[PDB]
Design an enzyme around this catalytic site. Sequence first.
Site, PDB file in Angstrom:
ATOM      1  N   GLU B 370       0.881  -1.168   0.000  1.00  0.00           N
ATOM      2  CA  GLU B 370       0.000   0.000   0.000  1.00  0.00           C
ATOM      3  C   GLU B 370       0.914   1.211   0.000  1.00  0.00           C
ATOM      4  OE1 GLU B 370      -0.290   2.468   2.389  1.00  0.00           O
ATOM      5  OE2 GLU B 370      -2.209   3.418   1.837  1.00  0.00           O
ATOM      6  N   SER B 574     -25.584  26.422 -18.783  1.00  0.00           N
ATOM      7  CA  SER B 574     -26.726  26.161 -17.886  1.00  0.00           C
ATOM      8  C   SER B 574     -26.488  24.901 -17.058  1.00  0.00           C
ATOM      9  CB  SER B 574     -28.024  25.932 -18.683  1.00  0.00           C
ATOM     10  OG  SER B 574     -29.060  25.829 -17.713  1.00  0.00           O
ATOM     11  N   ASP B 610     -30.150  -6.313  -5.703  1.00  0.00           N
ATOM     12  CA  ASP B 610     -29.316  -5.991  -6.853  1.00  0.00           C
ATOM     13  C   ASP B 610     -29.414  -4.499  -7.247  1.00  0.00           C
ATOM     14  OD1 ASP B 610     -28.362  -8.526  -6.983  1.00  0.00           O
ATOM     15  OD2 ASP B 610     -29.371  -9.063  -8.889  1.00  0.00           O
ATOM     16  N   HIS B 633     -15.602   7.174 -11.328  1.00  0.00           N
ATOM     17  CA  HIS B 633     -16.813   7.585 -10.590  1.00  0.00           C
ATOM     18  C   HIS B 633     -17.075   9.089 -10.915  1.00  0.00           C
ATOM     19  CE1 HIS B 633     -19.699   8.027  -7.237  1.00  0.00           C
ATOM     20  NE2 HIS B 633     -19.490   6.767  -6.877  1.00  0.00           N
TER      21      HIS B 633
HETATM   22  C1  LIG Z   1     -14.286  22.511  -0.085  1.00  0.00           C
HETATM   23  O1  LIG Z   1     -13.230  23.492  -0.164  1.00  0.00           O
HETATM   24  C2  LIG Z   1     -11.948  22.861   0.074  1.00  0.00           C
HETATM   25  C3  LIG Z   1     -11.112  23.710   1.044  1.00  0.00           C
HETATM   26  O2  LIG Z   1      -9.899  23.021   1.451  1.00  0.00           O
HETATM   27  C4  LIG Z   1      -9.951  22.617   2.841  1.00  0.00           C
HETATM   28  C5  LIG Z   1     -10.275  21.120   3.042  1.00  0.00           C
HETATM   29  O3  LIG Z   1      -9.916  20.235   1.927  1.00  0.00           O
HETATM   30  C6  LIG Z   1      -8.743  19.459   2.268  1.00  0.00           C
HETATM   31  C7  LIG Z   1      -9.066  18.062   2.810  1.00  0.00           C
HETATM   32  O4  LIG Z   1      -7.863  17.587   3.443  1.00  0.00           O
HETATM   33  C8  LIG Z   1      -7.809  16.122   3.171  1.00  0.00           C
HETATM   34  C9  LIG Z   1      -6.541  15.997   4.056  1.00  0.00           C
HETATM   35  O5  LIG Z   1      -5.244  16.406   3.419  1.00  0.00           O
HETATM   36  C10 LIG Z   1      -4.086  16.631   4.394  1.00  0.00           C
HETATM   37  C11 LIG Z   1      -3.286  15.607   4.994  1.00  0.00           C
HETATM   38  C12 LIG Z   1      -3.761  14.448   5.468  1.00  0.00           C
HETATM   39  N1  LIG Z   1      -2.677  13.811   5.923  1.00  0.00           N
HETATM   40  C13 LIG Z   1      -2.769  12.465   6.570  1.00  0.00           C
HETATM   41  C14 LIG Z   1      -2.083  11.382   5.765  1.00  0.00           C
HETATM   42  C15 LIG Z   1      -2.568   9.971   6.234  1.00  0.00           C
HETATM   43  C16 LIG Z   1      -2.586   9.073   4.971  1.00  0.00           C
HETATM   44  C17 LIG Z   1      -2.663   7.559   5.273  1.00  0.00           C
HETATM   45  N2  LIG Z   1      -2.360   6.977   3.966  1.00  0.00           N
HETATM   46  C18 LIG Z   1      -1.135   6.758   3.532  1.00  0.00           C
HETATM   47  O6  LIG Z   1      -0.139   6.958   4.220  1.00  0.00           O
HETATM   48  N3  LIG Z   1      -1.008   6.166   2.344  1.00  0.00           N
HETATM   49  C19 LIG Z   1       0.283   6.188   1.688  1.00  0.00           C
HETATM   50  C20 LIG Z   1       0.203   5.780   0.174  1.00  0.00           C
HETATM   51  C21 LIG Z   1      -0.986   6.504  -0.551  1.00  0.00           C
HETATM   52  C22 LIG Z   1      -0.945   6.426  -2.104  1.00  0.00           C
HETATM   53  O7  LIG Z   1       0.105   6.029  -2.658  1.00  0.00           O
HETATM   54  O8  LIG Z   1      -1.994   6.727  -2.711  1.00  0.00           O
HETATM   55  C23 LIG Z   1       0.756   7.667   1.684  1.00  0.00           C
HETATM   56  O9  LIG Z   1      -0.079   8.616   1.825  1.00  0.00           O
HETATM   57  O10 LIG Z   1       1.987   7.834   1.556  1.00  0.00           O
HETATM   58  C24 LIG Z   1      -4.110   7.223   5.698  1.00  0.00           C
HETATM   59  O11 LIG Z   1      -4.962   7.086   4.803  1.00  0.00           O
HETATM   60  O12 LIG Z   1      -4.256   6.948   6.911  1.00  0.00           O
HETATM   61  N4  LIG Z   1      -1.658  14.519   5.766  1.00  0.00           N
HETATM   62  N5  LIG Z   1      -1.953  15.602   5.207  1.00  0.00           N
HETATM   63 ZN   LIG Z   2      -1.298   2.846   5.860  1.00  0.00          ZN
HETATM   64 ZN   LIG Z   3       1.150   4.967   5.311  1.00  0.00          ZN
END
Ligand SMILES: COCCOCCOCCOCCOCc1cn(CCCC[C@H](NC(=O)N[C@@H](CCC(=O)O)C(=O)O)C(=O)O)nn1
Ligand SMILES: [Zn+2]
Ligand SMILES: [Zn+2]
EC number: 3.4.17.21
Lengths: 694, 694
Positions: B370, B574, B610, B633
Amino acid sequence: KHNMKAFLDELKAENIKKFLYNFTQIPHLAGTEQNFQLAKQIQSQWKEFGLDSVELAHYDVLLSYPNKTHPNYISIINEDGNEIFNTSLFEPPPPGYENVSDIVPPFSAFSPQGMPEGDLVYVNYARTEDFFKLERDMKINCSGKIVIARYGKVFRGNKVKNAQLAGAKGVILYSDPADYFAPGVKSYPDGWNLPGGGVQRGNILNLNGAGDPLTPGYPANEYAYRRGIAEAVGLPSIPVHPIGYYDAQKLLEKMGGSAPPDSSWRGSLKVPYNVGPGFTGNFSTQKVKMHIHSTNEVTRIYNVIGTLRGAVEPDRYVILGGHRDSWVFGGIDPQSGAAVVHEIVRSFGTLKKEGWRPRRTILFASWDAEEFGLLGSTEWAEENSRLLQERGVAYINADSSIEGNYTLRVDCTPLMYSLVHNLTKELKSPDEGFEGKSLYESWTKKSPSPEFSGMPRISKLGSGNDFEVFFQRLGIASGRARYTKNWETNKFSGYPLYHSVYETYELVEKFYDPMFKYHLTVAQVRGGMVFELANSIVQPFDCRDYAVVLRKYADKIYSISMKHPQEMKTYSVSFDSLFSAVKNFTEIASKFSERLQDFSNPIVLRMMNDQLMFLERAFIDPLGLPDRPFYRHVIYAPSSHNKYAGESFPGIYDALFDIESKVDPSKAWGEVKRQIYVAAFTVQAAAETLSEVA
Amino acid sequence: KHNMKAFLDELKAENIKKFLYNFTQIPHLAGTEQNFQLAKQIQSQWKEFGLDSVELAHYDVLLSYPNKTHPNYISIINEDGNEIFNTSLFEPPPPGYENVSDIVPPFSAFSPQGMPEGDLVYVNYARTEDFFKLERDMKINCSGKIVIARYGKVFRGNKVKNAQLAGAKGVILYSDPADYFAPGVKSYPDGWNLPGGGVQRGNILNLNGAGDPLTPGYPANEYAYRRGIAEAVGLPSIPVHPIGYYDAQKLLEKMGGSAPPDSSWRGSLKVPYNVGPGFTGNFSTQKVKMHIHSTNEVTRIYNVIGTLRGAVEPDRYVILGGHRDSWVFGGIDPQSGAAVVHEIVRSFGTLKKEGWRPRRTILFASWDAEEFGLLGSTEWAEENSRLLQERGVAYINADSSIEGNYTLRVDCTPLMYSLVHNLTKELKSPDEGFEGKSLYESWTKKSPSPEFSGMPRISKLGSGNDFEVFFQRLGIASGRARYTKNWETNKFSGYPLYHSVYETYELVEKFYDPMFKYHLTVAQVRGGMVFELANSIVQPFDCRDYAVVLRKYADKIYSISMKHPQEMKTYSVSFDSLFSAVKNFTEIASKFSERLQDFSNPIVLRMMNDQLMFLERAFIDPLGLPDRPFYRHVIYAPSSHNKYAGESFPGIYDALFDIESKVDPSKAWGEVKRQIYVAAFTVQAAAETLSEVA
Ligand SMILES: COCCOCCOCCOCCOCc1cn(CCCC[C@H](NC(=O)N[C@@H](CCC(=O)O)C(=O)O)C(=O)O)nn1
Ligand SMILES: [Zn+2]
Ligand SMILES: [Zn+2]
Ligand SMILES: *[C@@H]1O[C@H](CO)[C@@H](O[C@@H]2O[C@H](CO)[C@@H](O[C@@H]3O[C@H](CO)[C@@H](O)[C@H](O[C@H]4O[C@H](CO)[C@@H](O)[C@H](O)[C@@H]4O)[C@@H]3O)[C@H](O)[C@H]2NC(C)=O)[C@H](O)[C@H]1NC(C)=O
Ligand SMILES: *[C@@H]1O[C@H](CO)[C@@H](O[C@@H]2O[C@H](CO)[C@@H](O[C@@H]3O[C@H](CO)[C@@H](O)[C@H](O[C@H]4O[C@H](CO)[C@@H](O)[C@H](O)[C@@H]4O)[C@@H]3O)[C@H](O)[C@H]2NC(C)=O)[C@H](O)[C@H]1NC(C)=O
Ligand SMILES: COCCOCCOCCOCCOCc1cn(CCCC[C@H](NC(=O)N[C@@H](CCC(=O)O)C(=O)O)C(=O)O)nn1
Ligand SMILES: *[C@@H]1O[C@H](CO)[C@@H](O[C@@H]2O[C@H](CO)[C@@H](O)[C@H](O)[C@H]2NC(C)=O)[C@H](O)[C@H]1NC(C)=O
Ligand SMILES: *[C@@H]1O[C@H](CO)[C@@H](O[C@@H]2O[C@H](CO)[C@@H](O)[C@H](O)[C@H]2NC(C)=O)[C@H](O)[C@H]1NC(C)=O
Ligand SMILES: *[C@@H]1O[C@H](CO)[C@@H](O[C@@H]2O[C@H](CO)[C@@H](O)[C@H](O)[C@H]2NC(C)=O)[C@H](O)[C@H]1NC(C)=O
Ligand SMILES: *[C@@H]1O[C@H](CO)[C@@H](O[C@@H]2O[C@H](CO)[C@@H](O)[C@H](O)[C@H]2NC(C)=O)[C@H](O)[C@H]1NC(C)=O
Ligand SMILES: *[C@@H]1O[C@H](CO)[C@@H](O[C@@H]2O[C@H](CO)[C@@H](O)[C@H](O)[C@H]2NC(C)=O)[C@H](O)[C@H]1NC(C)=O
Ligand SMILES: *[C@@H]1O[C@H](CO)[C@@H](O[C@@H]2O[C@H](CO)[C@@H](O)[C@H](O)[C@H]2NC(C)=O)[C@H](O)[C@H]1NC(C)=O
Ligand SMILES: *[C@@H]1O[C@H](CO)[C@@H](O)[C@H](O)[C@H]1NC(C)=O
Ligand SMILES: *[C@@H]1O[C@H](CO)[C@@H](O)[C@H](O)[C@H]1NC(C)=O
Ligand SMILES: *[C@@H]1O[C@H](CO)[C@@H](O)[C@H](O)[C@H]1NC(C)=O
Ligand SMILES: *[C@@H]1O[C@H](CO)[C@@H](O)[C@H](O)[C@H]1NC(C)=O
Ligand SMILES: *[C@@H]1O[C@H](CO)[C@@H](O)[C@H](O)[C@H]1NC(C)=O
Ligand SMILES: *[C@@H]1O[C@H](CO)[C@@H](O)[C@H](O)[C@H]1NC(C)=O
Ligand SMILES: [Ca+2]
Ligand SMILES: [Ca+2]
Ligand SMILES: [Cl-]
Ligand SMILES: [Cl-]
Ligand SMILES: [Zn+2]
Ligand SMILES: [Zn+2]
C-alpha cells in the site's frame, strides 16, 4: 398449454406477407416524416397486440442527405472544361412507382462537399491488399487522383478509409455485373438482378462502434453537448459517390496507364480494367470531375421500445431488435425483418392475452437510423447501458429475413450454438426435397460445418448491423439468423438489388419467397430463440462451446505468428500463456457444466444463471482495443479491414497484420506480446467467473 | 443466539493489544523477507481462526529502495565544491531499537537518481496556490532551482508534480514543527511529537488509480507484459528527498531573496522563511546539492485473501481489507488497523465454529505494498475486476485504527450513512465523560455535522488508501472509520510521527490508547458494518441519502460557476440539466424506498438487493475522467490538487478550476458544458436503475 409450440403455431406466413406489404409502399428514410409516421403506427399496433408498455425513444443525431435543388453527379470534362458525359441524377423508378415522391437519389451518406477534378485510378475493390498491390508492387501513386472502386468483398466505409490513406482526392463506387449480376437471371423487374441504371446507396463512415458522430459515449438527448464537425467521429475527408454499371462503363472504357495486374482485377464489363492513372492517349487531356453537395444535418430519429414484463425475473432482459429505417422502400432491408418482428410480437401478445407471461422480460425494438451508422440502437444502448450490462441476457437481431432462398444462415456467440442446434431440430424444413425433415437436417446438408461432421456452419458475428453495441461494446450474448443463398454456385455479393430503389415488396413476393415460407421459418428461428432465452429455467447457454472455439482461435492466431519464426525467437514471443488460459477455461467450463446439471434451490439457480449471463460480459475489456475504445470484446471485433467480417483475437491479429513492413520490429513485436498478455488474462478472467463463487 | 451482539461481544481489547505487539517488533517493508514471513503467519492464523480458505495472491510490481552502500543525503556546498553541511543518513533509532536491523533510512520512494546542485526556492506547502503566488504575484521563477517545501496540507505526490511543472530540478521535503509538533507535548519517546531528527517517509508517485506503474489495466502476474521505465505511470522526473526540522533549519537559515509574502508562509522555526532564490549575500556563492541513488526494482508482493463463504448468497461479497506493509515498525500505520482486522476475523471464526455463517460471503484482505502506491489492493482488483463488479456489495477499509483519541471519524459513500448512524447508536462510547452513553451521542457532540442538527459529521472518501480501486475505479460502495484528534484545537497535520521510525507499539500503548478501548470501539464499528452488510436481509443502503448529497454537490458546483456570470451568459452555460437529473433521482429514490419497505418473495428481494448493490456502480463512466482513466466515478474523485481529499463532480470542478486564466475561453467553457452534460446524464442514468425494472 402455453409452451414454445403454442407460440410457434400462432406465427402465420400470411400475416408476415400483409405486414411486409404494409411496410414497403412508401420510402421510410431515417429522419423523414414518413418514418416517424411508421414509428407511430408500430407503437400503436404493438400496444394493440398486447405489450405492457410501448414507448418512442428519440435522439437528435447527425444524418446526411443530398441537396434537392443542387444534385450530385460525376462528369468527364474536356480541356475547355465542357462536361461531355454526366452520370445519372436518379435510378429509373420501377413499374408502378414512377410517381412515388421522396425517393432519395443515390448518394454516399456523410460524404463532404466538393468538386474535385482529376485523373482516375482504378483500385479493384479498394481493399487493403488492393492498395498494397498498387503502391508496393505496381508503384502506382494514388495521391491527388480520383479513385474508382467496385463495390463488393468489404464494407464501403473501409474502401473510403483505404482510398483516403492512399491520398485520393475523391472516390467513385460502382456495382460491377461480376459482383451484382448472377449469370442466367434477368434484371429487375423481370428477375432479381441489378439493372445497369441501378445504384447501391449506403453510408461511408468509420465509426468503430461510436454511434452518432457528435456524441460518442453518451446519448444524443435534449441537453447533449455535441462535438464540432471537425472533431466528429468517423467522417470521410474526401467526396464519394456511387454509380451503376452503365455509367461506370463510360468512366472505365477510356482508362489507360497500366494493365490490370491479373484476372482478379477484371470484372465483367467490356473494358480492359486498366489501372490508370488517367485515360489512353486520344483522351489524355480529359479529366473526371465530381460534384457533391450533400449536407450533414442533426435530425430527430425515433426508436420504438415495447416491453413484455417477466413473471418471475422481470429484471432480466431478452431483446429482439431490428431497424425500421430504409434507403428507399426496404423490400428486403429491413422490412422483411421488421414484418417478422411484427408477427413475433403479435404471437407473444396472443399468449399474453390468455394469461401467459414469459419467465424473463422481453424487450422488442424497432430501431431508427441503422442505415446511417447503427445510430438508433447505439444511442439507446448508450442511454441504457447500466441497465443492459447488469440485466441483459441476450440480444437477437432482426434485419433482413432473406438474402436468398437456399438455406439457413446463423451468426452468433458460441454460447448460443447448442440452443440453435436444438431449436432447428424441432422446426420443419421449408426446403423443396426436405418435406417432413427438420430444418437442422436441411441446413446441415446444404451448409456443412467445416470442422464437424453432421453439424451445420454457424459463423462468428461481424458487424454492420444493430447488434454491434450490444455484443462488441457491452458483451451481451447476441445472435442473428436469416435465409441465404448458396455461396458456392454464386460468386456475387450479398443480394444484387441491395440498397437500390428496386428492393420492393414485388421483388420479395415474385422472386424470393412467394409463399412466405422462408420468412415464416426465420420467424420461428428468431422467435423460438427469444422464447427459449426468455423462458428456460436455466439459461440455454453452453459455456463448453466457447472453450472449443477459443482453442480454434488460439491455434489460428499462433499459426499467423509462426509465419515469422526468426522474430518469435529474437523477441521471445510465446503463446504459452494464451493456450494455458484456454486449457483452464476448458477445465473450468467442464466442471461448471457438471454443477449446472447436478443442482429446488432458486438462489443456486439464479447464481448459476448469473454466471451464464455474465460469461459473455467477462470478455469485455473496459480499456477497449487499440484506438477503438467502443470495441471492447477481446475475443471478437469487426475486422479493421472490413466492418462486415468478424475477427477473432482482434488485438493480436491487428498487432501481427503486415508486421514485416513495420520500421521498428522490436516495438511491433513488443505490441504483439502485449496483446497476447491481454488476451490470455481476459480468457483466464472469464474462466474464473465460472469457478465456484466462494 | 448468533446475532450482531454475539459477534461484537467476542471482540476483546486485550487481543487487539497482543496482535499489535506481535505485528510491530520488526520492520515489515513491502517486498522484504520479513513482510513475506508476516503474510505467511497471518495466512496460518486466519485458517486456525476458522476461515474456509486463506490464500496468498502474489504480484511482481515496481518498488523503490535506497542503495544500502551509496546513501542518499543533501549538502550545502561552497564555491570550491566542499560539502560544508550534510543532512542525516538515518533517524536516531528509538530506545531499545538501536540494534534493530533493516530499518530503511528516510527516502522518497520512486525518486529518480541524480546529483543536482543549485539555488533554493522555498515554496511553502508546494500547493497549486503556493505556486500561483510565487509565479503570478511574486514573479519568482522556479525553473532550474531546487525547491524546498514543508510537508502538510496535501499529498506529497501533488507537491512533487507541482514543483516539476514549475521547472524545479529537485525537491526537498521537510517536517516543520508548525505542522508536526503540537504545543505543550514532548517529542518521542517522552510524548507523541516529532523530534528534530524525525523524518516522514512516503512515495511521491502520481498514479491516478493506475496501480503498479508498469502494468496499468492488468494484474502484474507471471506473464504480464510490462511497460519500459520511460513509459511507466506516475514516476517523478526530478530527485526528491525528505528531511527533519533540525536539517531543514540548516538549509533555510541562510535563505535570502524575497521575504515570505505573508504569515501563512511562516512555520515555527527560527528562520525568516525567505522565499529565495538562493542565500543572503555572505553565502550567495554557496549552493545546495542533492545525492539520490535509490533504485526502482520489480519485486514480489503478497496479499493474504481469506474467505468466509455465505450461507444464502455466496456470490455476494462484503470485503474488509487493509494493508500489512509498513515503512518501519508500523505502530499506528498500518498495524493498529491490521490488529483490529485480525481480531474481527477471530470473532467471525468463533461464530463459524459454532455453526453460524453470514448470509453473504465475507472476504478478508491483508494487502501488500500500500505504501508504494496502493499496489497490492489495486493489482488484486485488476485481476478480479469481473467478479468484483458483478458481485461486490461493499468494501470496508482497515488501515490505522487511531490518529488521535478524541472522537470517531468516518468517511464513506452516502449509501452507508444510515447504517453508520444506526450502528453507532447501538455501540457504547469509550470517551471520558460519556460513560453509559452511545458512541453516536459522543461522536455527534464532538464532531457535529455542518449541515444538520443532532447528526455527526461524515466526510466524502478522498484517496491515498486501499479503497481507491474499489470505490473510484469499480464503483463498489466503500467506507472507512477510525478514532481521530480534535481538529479545532489542533493545527498540525495527520499525527506527528506518521511514517517515521518512532511509530512504534510503545507510541500507541503509552500515548494513544493504553487500555485499547479506542481500538476496540473501532473494531466494533468496522466489524459491525461488515456484519450488517453481510447479514441484513435487505442491503443496509439508503438511496435517499445519495439524493440529499447530490443536491448539495450540485449547489456547490453551480456556485463555483456563478463566480463567472459574464461567461455563463456568453457561452450559454446552464446547470438546468444537472438540477433536473438530481430532482429526478430524488423522486425515483423516494419511490424505490417505498417499494423496498412495502414488498415473502426472494426474487423481488434480490432484484431489489441488486438495485441497491448496483446503485454505486451506476456512477461509473467507463470512459473515465479526462486524462485519468482509472478515476471513473462521476460524483467522487480524489482532488487533482491533493490525492487525500475528495472532490465532488470532479469533471466539472476541474473544468472550472482557474478557468479565468485559460487562453481560449470558448474552448474552456465548452468543456465545462461538456462535463455538465456528462454529470447530468450519469445522475439520471443512476436514478433510472432504481425505477421499476419492467
Ligand atoms: C471545499 O473546499 C476545500 C477547502 O480546502 C480545505 C479542506 O480540503 C482538504 C481536505 O484535506 C484532506 C486531508 O489532506 C491533508 C493531509 C492528510 N494527511 C494524513 C495522511 C494519512 C494518509 C494515510 N495513507 C497513507 O499513508 N497512504 C500512503 C500511500 C498513498 C498512495 O500512494 O496513494 C501515503 O499517503 O503515503 C491514511 O490514509 O491513513 N496529511 N496531510
Ligand atoms: Zn497505511
Ligand atoms: Zn502509510
Ligand atoms: C491456469 O491455471 C493454473 C492453475 O491450475 C495456473 O497455474 C498457476 O501458474 C502460475 C505460473 O504462471 C504459478 O505461479 C507460481 O506460483 C508459485 C507460488 O505458488 C511461485 O513460487 C512461482 O514463482 C517462481 O517461479 C517462477 C517461474 O519460473 C519465477 O518466475 C519466479 O521468479 C519464482 O521463482 C510462480 O509465480 C501458480 O502457482 C499456479 N497456480 C496454481 C498451480 O494453483 C495458471 O497460471 C493458469 N493460466 C493462466 C494463463 O492464468
Ligand atoms: C427528469 O425526468 C423528466 C420526466 O419526468 C424528463 O423529462 C423529459 O424531458 C425532455 C426534455 O429534455 C422531454 O423531451 C421532450 O419530448 C417531447 C416528446 O415527448 C419532444 O417533442 C420535445 O422536443 C421538442 O421541444 C424541444 C424543447 O423546446 C425542442 O428542442 C425540440 O426541437 C422539439 O421541438 C422534447 O424532446 C421529455 O418528453 C420528458 N419526458 C417525460 C416528461 O416523460 C427529464 O428529461 C429528466 N431529466 C434528465 C436530466 O434526464
Ligand atoms: C479467415 O481468413 C479470412 C479470409 O477472407 C475471406 C472471408 O472473410 C470475409 C467475410 O466476409 C464478410 C462479408 O463481407 C462482404 C459483403 C457482405 N455484404 C452484404 C452487406 C449486407 C449488410 C446489411 N447491413 C447493412 O446494410 N447495414 C448498413 C449500415 C452498417 C453500418 O453503418 O455499420 C450498411 O452496411 O450500409 C446486413 O447486415 O444485412 N456485402 N459485401
Ligand atoms: C398499414 O396498416 C396500418 C394499420 O392497419 C394502416 O393504418 C391505419 O389506417 C386506417 C385507415 O386509414 C386508420 O383508420 C387507422 O387509424 C390506421 N391505424 C394505425 C395507424 O395504427 C395503414 O393505412 C396501412 N398502410 C398501408 C400503406 O397500407
Ligand atoms: C452535364 O451537365 C452539365 C450541368 O448541367 C451541363 O453543362 C451545363 O450546360 C448548361 C446549358 O447548356 C450551361 O448553361 C451550363 O453552364 C453548363 N454547366 C457546367 C457546369 O458546365 C452539360 O451540358 C451536361 N453534359 C451532357 C453531355 O449532357
Ligand atoms: C440441447 O439438447 C441436449 C439433448 O437433450 C441437451 O443436453 C442434455 O441435457 C440434459 C438436461 O440437462 C442432460 O441430462 C443430458 O445429459 C444432455 N444430453 C447431452 C449433453 O447429450 C442440451 O442441454 C440442450 N442445450 C441447450 C438447452 O442449450
Ligand atoms: C507473533 O505471533 C506468532 C503466532 O503465535 C508467532 O509465531 C509462532 O511462533 C512459535 C514460536 O516460535 C512457533 O512455534 C509457531 O509456529 C509460530 N506460529 C505461526 C507463525 O503461525 C511469532 O513468534 C510472534 N512474533 C513475535 C515477534 O512475537
Ligand atoms: C559531507 O559528506 C561528504 C561525503 O562523505 C564529505 O566529503 C568527503 O570527505 C571525504 C573525507 O574527508 C573525501 O575523501 C571525499 O572526497 C569527500 N566527498 C565529497 C563528495 O566531497 C564531507 O566532508 C561531509 N561534510 C561534513 C561537514 O561532514
Ligand atoms: C436505521 O434505523 C431506522 C429506524 O429503525 C430504520 O428506519 C426504519 O425502518 C423500518 C423497517 O423498514 C421502517 O418500518 C421504519 O418506518 C423506519 N423508520 C424511519 C425511516 O424513521 C432504517 O431503515 C435503518 N437504516 C438502515 C437499516 O440502513
Ligand atoms: C442547396 O442548394 C441550393 C441551390 O443552389 C442552395 O441555395 C441551398 O443553400 C442548398 N441547401 C443546403 C441545405 O445547403
Ligand atoms: C505520391 O505523390 C505526391 C506527389 O504529388 C508525393 O508527395 C508522394 O510522396 C508520392 N509518393 C510516392 C511516389 O511514393
Ligand atoms: C429461388 O430458388 C430457385 C431454386 O433453386 C432458384 O433457381 C432461384 O434462383 C431462387 N431465387 C432467388 C432470389 O434466389
Ligand atoms: C549501489 O551502490 C554501489 C556502491 O557504490 C554500487 O556498486 C551498486 O551498483 C549500487 N546498487 C544498485 C542496486 O544500484
Ligand atoms: C524561467 O527561467 C528560464 C530561464 O532560465 C526561462 O526559460 C523561463 O521562460 C523563465 N520564465 C519566466 C521568467 O517566466
Ligand atoms: C489523549 O487524550 C488526552 C485528553 O484529551 C489528551 O490530552 C492527549 O493529548 C491525547 N493523546 C493523544 C496522542 O492525542
Ligand atoms: Ca452518442
Ligand atoms: Ca497492474
Ligand atoms: Cl439480421
Ligand atoms: Cl482506514
Ligand atoms: Zn438493414
Ligand atoms: Zn441496409
